[PDB]
Write a structure and sequence with these properties.
The structure holds two protein chains of two kinds. By secondary structure, chain A is an alpha+beta fold. Chain A is 25% helix and 37% strand. Chain A has a four-stranded antiparallel sheet with strand order 2-3-1-4, covered by helices on one side. In chain A, a hairpin with a 5-residue loop joins β2 (28-32) and β3 (38-42). The longest helix of chain A has 9 residues, at 15-23. Chain A is globular and about 45 Å long. Chain B is of the alpha/beta class. Helices cover 31% and strands 19% of the residues of chain B. Chain B has a single domain, classed as Peptidase S8/S53 domain (Rossmann fold). In chain B, the strands form two sheets. Chain B has a seven-stranded parallel sheet, with helices on both faces. Chain B has a two-stranded antiparallel ribbon with strand order 10-11. Classes of the chains: A alpha+beta, B alpha/beta. The interface between A and B is medium-sized, with 23 and 44 residues. β5 (65-68) of chain A pairs antiparallel with β6 (115-116) of chain B, so a sheet runs across the interface. The structure holds zinc ion (ZN) (5 copies). One zinc ion is lined by residues 248, 250 of chain B. The PDB classes it as hydrolase.
Chain lengths: 71, 264
């Protein structure tokens, strides 16, 4: 469903720049990474589609869950 | 209450020489590290769990237990509570990325990730690769997914080449039945009934590859405290190359870490 990470191509180091690509399609920025060229966002299906078609965007992947490995 | 695990990896060999992890910064990326603990020293930390702002409150118990095991191996290490999992023990890939990036920015020496997922993330791979490129020793639990015939069951981020993947043995050096397997497995450490610190000033036993990983993170801290100029590459190589062979490498990797041999 709704939680994603959006990977960017070069030249989008600034959070304002990443956020513009996301917010203009109506997505909501959750966090811009510092070293990784990506940002977390909440996105509806249309936003995901438009992002996958945006030349700025390297990938859109689910922001999946990782868990403590105690048994 | 201290894991039998400390002696099993030969950590007291380093302590006997006068090295206990002094000045080494270890980031514990977990559910926080509880402030309730009299002995547990925590140098600092930060939370990346939106609904849980205090990295010094551990509402799960995992992070405090892992932290205690690091210090049991390396009593003088500086621990940082990097809260990337919430009370239920889960966290989003992006929270974990935020913790790794915090560790890089704050010049941590060692990252411990006693966490896993069956699937990877390109952004998480980028994060761990960047941490290793910047010189950080990155250690993860291999996973608790047992066997699946001939298939790898190693979880991410342990499955990424840049990350040391740590399986679990018991006090007899037998692989724990839950311990994940595969060619990505690097080394083993004690992970069955490990006694360590729990929230509320408690002590108690837990099992899992989450318990094995901190023995290797602490081992890395011991080695760096003796050899502050060795690179992460050199630390990793030392631990892998000098491990005690324990059986078939699909199940045991290079075998059990031996910090005595590694810190030559
Ligand atoms: Zn000792
Ligand atoms: Zn205590
Ligand atoms: Zn690996
Ligand atoms: Zn040296
Ligand atoms: Zn075999």
């Amino acid at each position: 469903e709704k939680k994603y990470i959006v990977g960017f191509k070069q030249g989008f180091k600034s959070c304002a720049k990443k956020e513009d690509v996301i917010s203009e399609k109506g997505g909501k920025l959750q966090k811009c990474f510092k070293y990784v060229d990506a940002a977390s966002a909440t996105l509806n299906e249309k936003a995901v589609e438009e992002l996958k078609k945006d030349p700025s965007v390297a990938y859109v992947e689910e922001d999946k869950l990782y868990r403590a490995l105690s048994a | 209450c201290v894991s039998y695990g400390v002696a099993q990896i030969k950590a007291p060999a380093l302590h006997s020489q006068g090295y206990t992890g002094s000045n080494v910064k270890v980031a514990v990326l977990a559910s926080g590290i509880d402030s309730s603990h009299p002995d547990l020293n925590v140098a600092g930390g930060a939370s990346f769990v939106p609904s849980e702002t205090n990295p010094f409150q551990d509402n799960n118990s995992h992070g405090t237990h892992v932290a205690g095991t690091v210090l049991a191996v390396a009593p003088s290490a500086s621990l940082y509570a990097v809260k990337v999992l919430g009370a239920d023990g889960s966290g989003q890939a992006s929270w974990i990325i935020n913790g790794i990036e915090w560790a890089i920015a704050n010049n941590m020496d060692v990252i411990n990730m006693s966490l896993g997922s069956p699937s990877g993330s390109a952004a998480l791979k980028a994060a761990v690769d960047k941490a290793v490129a910047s010189g950080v020793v990155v250690v993860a639990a291999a996973g608790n997914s047992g066997t699946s015939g001939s298939s790898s069951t190693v979880s991410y981020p342990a499955k990424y080449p840049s990350v040391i993947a740590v399986g679990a043995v018991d006090s007899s050096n037998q692989r724990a039945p839950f311990s994940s397997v595969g060619p990505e497995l690097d080394v083993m450490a004690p992970g069955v009934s490990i006694c360590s610190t729990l929230p509320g000033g408690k002590y108690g036993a837990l099992s899992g590859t989450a318990m094995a990983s901190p023995h290797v993170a602490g081992a890395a801290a011991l080695i760096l405290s003796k050899h502050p100029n060795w690179t992460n590459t050199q630390v990793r190589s030392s631990l892998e190359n000098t491990a005690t062979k324990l059986g078939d490498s699909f199940y045991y990797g290079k075998g059990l870490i031996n910090v005595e041999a590694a810190a030559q």
